[model samples]
Target: AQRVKITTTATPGEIELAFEDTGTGLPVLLVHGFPLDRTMWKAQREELCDEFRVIVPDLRGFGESQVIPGVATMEAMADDLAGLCNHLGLTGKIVLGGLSMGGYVAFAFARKYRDRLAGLILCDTRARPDSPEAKENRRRVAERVRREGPGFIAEEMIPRLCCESTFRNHPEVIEKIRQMILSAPPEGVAAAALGMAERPDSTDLLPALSCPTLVLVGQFDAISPPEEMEAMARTIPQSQFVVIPDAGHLPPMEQPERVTQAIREWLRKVHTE
Candidate 1:
């Protein structure tokens, strides 16, 4: 297969959605999680690039993307994706995807463009709103980001977001991931933190998604837990769920090969159906 080349372009609000894609096949948009950027897909893009038009974008306030003063909600992020697909001239069904916060945006995409989708891939993400305790933590973190900056994510939350072994075994990788978190503008990160805290209770929308859905999670994901993944599978009537081993929160970064394989199989299955 020919190697796919990565290209960069700006979306609405000047968010830079850098994508590594080939001559168009099925348009697939990949969104990254919170405190991370499009670079989170660095591992899987090469592996999955040939089959779909792979798009990876830096969400508002993260990566090379521009951060508008007051538009960092997942809804805003999802709109950016919708605009991107429209600009690409893909007016039909397209595959929309995300990891973590990107997964949050995926739900938004489902709501925003439910009829315009061929498939949906959600990795290490959830649909439910935050529990009281979780919401409190997000508030505290948001306050910190507002007061300090993206550094708090790098300094504090980043480690908790990954596995213990990841920190013990690969310090450099952790630092690299931290750098991505730290690169975001504080105001933008703060806005996203608020959005994550206040996102709609999407558990209600799961059953309504008739499109083929693929849900992937890290086996040891403490954030979304195995039971949560199971719950998601139970809700979405035709969704497929898989857990990648030796991974914690971010499966794409920790176990990209397994994630890629799962996605490849899921894509083929969706097409055949």
Candidate 2:
């Protein structure tokens, strides 16, 4: 059910976001990665909701959210989430989890709305901005998406989103990813692609983060390797790192149990306050 809609003042008069709000108790907000929507957090939403109120939103231009015709920067998405918190009448801190591109937005959120976070979950993502070559490539891809639409992106990204083991054994997971990508609007994909390319490097934001953080990665993730993520965890004053074995870039789908439990356990440990 699409349970909420609100125009965030971040980009005032721009777009209203779509989100799901369910369960009870303290709040936890989960942000989905690029080219995907809130549905990516299905397992976490279902399992964690019993113990916590779960808030999952489709980033602007993805899923049912109002699509921004032009660029939708990470800060824009972060402010949208902060506005969601405002509309829900939530004044306290929230545990914010963001995967892949969502992780970039999480960093932006911490920078802009530090007081709203109780803890952080950084999963299957990186802190560095795109290299010059990579940024150019992202722009190139965005151009292609503008002309050709989102079809090619799914074909190129699906293989990279998971490891060989997942490809061989998990057809359902890959199909779900494909469906999400296909469902996304072409302009939405292009705009977000440009946004990501323009996003600033988040490396400097790590050491200054004082909130409890849990960093997770897949054992075989190629996008953001496990080694770099482990190093990222170390910089944070209060952080725990975990690698989901036998998984790839999208561990939550590749190894749902490991991803969920790591989060469940970490939240129990740090969020008891």
Candidate 3:
């Protein structure tokens, strides 16, 4: 684990994001999902920072990032990232990566500014719209979060995401995950839950995404099932899908090696233009 510096930008109020690593190459911008900040990429950052210009930025309203009110949409969050890229003098394209809600933002970034990315790395995420029932469930959860904060969701979500057997065996890691969720800013969590409930239907965009794509899900990922991930691979032309064994909804935390290995292989397959 290495220390990273967070810088802030203003578009009325201040917005802060953190980045780590300085290797020479096109950047790999990592976007972490709900209840986790850049810290979720702890394992991946150590492995990939040497080979790629690895960047893990806390998305707006999460982690060390300042909670900018009214910034709930992924497009707005992507704009913040774009502004940061401009500040860094990056040009042409950077690799875009996101997990769960972060993955949703990545897709939004690709749709809005496809020209600015060289590749897409999606993990523990899906490209399909939720069923009406599932959408309603998310709305119910959102309401609960708003009324009582994120603790109730955090309490139940982790166990559901993990396989029953693994949770029984890995109490230490599970506890750490609990702490990570508990530390999340309540306002940020509430805002993210609201945005996630309203995320645009992205099933149609799967085929339209022409960029080189790599998708992975944890074997025990009940959040976005592995079969759903496979179907996404089938839908996205030339995309590769891998299911990391023994992982749950959050692969980077539970199966960092599998997730990073898949991403590294995808990077190796890319042709320099």
Candidate 4:
């Protein structure tokens, strides 16, 4: 994958969005979740590159993206993506997808730039805003990070982010996830947490999604459970839902082949329709 940078007026100062592109074919843009970089989609990029142009981006304040000094809103991230598409001269509609926090930005993108999206892939995410308790927790986390740094926050999330099966059987995967979180820029993580706390509820936007949409969740994802994703799938006019067994929040990493196959099958449907 080759890296590129695109500047967008998505924040207080112009934000430089950093992304990687690989292969050639139908364009598929995959947005990474909070605290994780574009590398989260390494499996998908490698597998899908054979048949699709895979683009993975590190959101503002994460990975190689400039760590701008402010809270990064989902709306800003969505706009940055639109700017990215324009910068790349991708005039045709493209497949847009995200995982976890990235999914929140996807919804924002769909709402703001519906005409640019050919299909949607929402993985291990929900259409709801942070609950009062969840919001409070995010604030607490942000405050703690400001004082103690990201290590404690990453350590605290490690257990909750994965399933019992992974903990016992997939030690390497667990380590990979841990390292991703641990290596994240502290300011980026804290800013994103605070921004997420302020995100609007996105359930109202679901019924308006006219494009083909695929929702995937890990069978044991406590954060965005199968039932929640199933309900979300029902809201969209054209949607398919899948569940990957033995995985948790990050199915793309935990069950790469299953996730990649599901996405490819959905891509076929998108093109046919």
> Best candidate, lDDT-wise?
2
Residues 1-273, candidate 1: write the lDDT tens digits.
Answer: 111112222234344444444434777778988888877887777777667667776766666666655436677777777766666676788888898889899998888778888899988888888888987887777778877877756776675677877778777778778888877777778778777887888988899997999988888888878778878978997889898887888888877789889998898878532
lDDT of 2: 0.88
- lDDT of model 1 at position 219: 83
- The stretch of ten residues in a row with the least summed lDDT in candidate 3 is 1-10
Whole-model lDDT values for every prediction:
0.76, 0.88, 0.75, 0.86
Which candidate has the top score in TM-score?
2
Error of 1 at 171 (Å): 3.4
Better of 1 and 2 by lDDT: 2
Q: What tens-digit string does per-residue lDDT give for candidate 3 at 1-273?
A: 233332323343345655555466758888888777887887787787667777777776777776655436766677777776776777578888899888888888887888898888888887655667876776676666556876887788787766665577777767777776777776777666666666788888878887888888888788888988888878887787888988888888777787788887788776253
| Model 3 C-alpha lDDT versus the unseen true structure | 0.75
Clashes in model 3: which pairs?
none
Question: Between which residue pairs do clashes occur in model 4?
Answer: none
- Ranked by lDDT, the better of candidates 3 and 4 is 4
Off by over 4 Å in 2: none
* C-alpha root-mean-square deviation, each candidate: 4.1, 1.3, 3.0, 1.6
Q: Please give each candidate's TM-score.
A: 0.88, 0.96, 0.88, 0.95
Clashes (candidate 2): 0
Clashing pairs in model 1?
A: none
Sorted by lDDT, highest first, which candidate order results?
A: 2, 4, 1, 3
